[PDB]
């Protein structure tokens, strides 16, 4: 036994109290404008950089069949010139503040944000409001982007995982708004115009659905003044056309189903199996986070996969069942998705499928306390890593105000995580997994993937 090299550390998983980390974590201030727009900041005391942007409770879910793809086309168009600044003027002004603009468009969330330095907060606010409110939406730029999107559609230029997940959302959420892709079909792109973009932005980009979230080096009062000057002219929302009324009017539906996308000369075999999960507001979403940490993820560039804490990672790494896999926990406003996605080939696809199904059903019966303590510690450590980057702080502020209605404090989040034990994991796994319908999606070399009855049979055990 080494005296200095063997103290302080041991492989026995024990619960860790993260309470002393809460003393120095910063506070979030929220101000609601008369427009209905919330302004939320989180000042890190010695930060030199700032992430700030606009988060919108809108996306591909709130479109129709006629204009499906308008929100994704908007991030192609919006940066191509405004009514006060040209393309080159915007490029020069963004270059001089030393940052980059960025945009994401989800099924239910959209953000446009800037990662700048602390001296360029007001300039970033002005630029973001300028693209958001006074865009040109020129027909020539629309025609210049339509052909590029049509070429990349004809080439089938897509990631494999995004292809599988789009098939999974399409077959699990049949005949509901969440089954549409963000990109949209080919015909809507072939018949897009400026009027649909104007109507979408006029309908959905309103005051109660928009959060201006800034993290890093930022003062709250100055951002309040700048937001009231710039974003003060956004329309308010009718009570009859709120987000909740649209959610009630077109609800999500989960259907147990199966799809594969077969190719004649492919090499890989990507596959995802998901169960109907929890919405964002379900209190069972925290145990689903812990269970997703318990399942974990692995890719074959790591060599310590056989010494993993997770039994699924151990099985896949030891037997070589997949080149990479990951467990996912997707949450929406009124439903969710929980499952495992992986990449394999056609000779290891059935054994990988069996490993996924056997490890999912095993959590209903046998869960040991060491795994739960390990996963709680890993999830709390992962939450502390997001606090290190101001981009993740701003993203979490925007997401939490949009989908929870409030900024969940870190003490409440640690207390809600620490209340999860093995009985809770068994109960949540019994509720969501055991003898339930699932959704199966695959793409590539999928001739040896088992059909739906094989997957349906392995959601329960006949021996207990």
């Amino acid at each position: 036994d080494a005296n200095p090299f063997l103290r302080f550390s041991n492989p026995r998983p024990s619960p860790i109290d993260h309470t002393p980390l809460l003393s120095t974590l910063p506070e979030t201030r929220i101000t609601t404008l008369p427009n209905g727009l919330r302004v939320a900041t989180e000042a890190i005391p010695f930060a030199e950089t700032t992430t700030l942007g606009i988060w919108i409770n809108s996306g591909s879910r709130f479109e129709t069949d006629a204009n499906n793809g308008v929100a994704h086309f908007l991030e192609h168009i919006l940066f191509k010139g405004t009514k006060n600044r040209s393309v080159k003027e915007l490029e020069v002004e963004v270059e001089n503040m030393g940052g980059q603009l960025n945009a994401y468009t989800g099924r239910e969330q959209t953000c446009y944000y800037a990662k700048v330095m602390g001296k360029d907060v007001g300039k970033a606010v002005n630029i973001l409001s300028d693209i958001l409110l006074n865009s040109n939406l020129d027909a020539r730029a629309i025609d210049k982007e339509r052909d590029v999107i049509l070429r990349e559609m004809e080439e089938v230029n897509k990631q494999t995982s995004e292809l599988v997940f789009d098939h999974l959302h399409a077959t699990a959420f049949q005949y509901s708004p969440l089954g549409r892709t963000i990109l949209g079909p080919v015909e809507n792109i072939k018949s897009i115009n400026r009027d649909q973009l104007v109507e979408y932005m006029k309908t959905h980009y309103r005051g109660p659905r928009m959060v201006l979230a800034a993290a890093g080096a930022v003062n709250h009062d100055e951002l309040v003044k700048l937001a009231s000057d710039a974003f003060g002219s956004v329309p308010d929302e009718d009570a009859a056309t709120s987000v909740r009324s649209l959610l009630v009017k077109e609800p999500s539906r989960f259907t147990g189903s199966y799809v594969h996308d077969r190719f004649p000369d492919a090499s890989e075999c990507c596959m995802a199996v998901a169960f109907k999960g929890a919405s964002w507001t379900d209190p069972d979403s925290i145990p689903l986070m812990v269970m997703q940490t318990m399942l974990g993820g692995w890719d074959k560039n790591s060599t310590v996969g056989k010494h993993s804490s997770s039994a699924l990672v151990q099985t896949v790494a030891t037997e070589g069942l997949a080149d990479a896999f990951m467990a996912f926990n997707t949450n929406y406003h009124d439903t969710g998705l929980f499952g495992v996605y992986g990449v394999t080939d056609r000779d290891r696809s059935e054994d990988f499928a069996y490993a996924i199904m056997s490890n999912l059903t095993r959590m209903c019966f046998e869960v040991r306390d060491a795994d739960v303590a390990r996963a709680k510690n890993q999830l709390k450590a992962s939450l502390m890593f997001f606090q290190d980057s101001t981009h993740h702080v701003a993203e979490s502020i925007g997401r939490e105000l949009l989908v929870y209605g409030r900024r969940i404090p870190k003490a409440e989040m640690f207390a809600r995580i620490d209340a999860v034990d093995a009985n809770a994991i068994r109960a949540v796994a019994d509720r969501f997994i055991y003898d339930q319908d699932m959704a199966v999606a695959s793409a590539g070399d999928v001739q040896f993937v088992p059909d739906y009855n094989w997957f349906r049979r392995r959601s329960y055990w006949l021996r207990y």
Binding site: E48, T49, E95, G98, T390
Partner: protein, 97 residues
């Protein structure tokens, strides 16, 4: 054309780009620890404040002098690919002389 002179707006833009890169490298704790370790190993000290002061206190004349001294020094030239079109090597390293 860089050796022919930089014009104010380009100098300010490049200084802001360099400052943004320098400050975004040390924004997170692992990046800051890596920067401190590499600077202490290479020099014996960490001087990010002095690097920022040097970036901000740079004039266009100093940059033009720097590029002028650079182009006098012999360069390094590397090509790649299924090379089926190339000017001769002697005339390649002549345009800076």
């Amino acid at each position: 054309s860089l050796a022919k002179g930089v014009t104010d707006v380009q100098l300010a833009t490049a200084k802001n780009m360099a400052l943004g890169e320098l400050r975004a490298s040390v924004a997170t704790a692992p990046g800051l620890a890596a920067a401190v370790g590499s600077s202490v190993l290479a020099t014996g000290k960490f001087s990010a404040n002095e690097v920022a002061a040097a970036l901000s206190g740079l004039t266009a004349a100093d940059v033009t002098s720097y590029v002028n001294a650079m182009i006098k020094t012999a360069p390094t030239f590397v090509t790649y690919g299924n090379l089926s079109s190339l000017p001769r090597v002697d005339s390649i390293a002549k345009r800076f002389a």
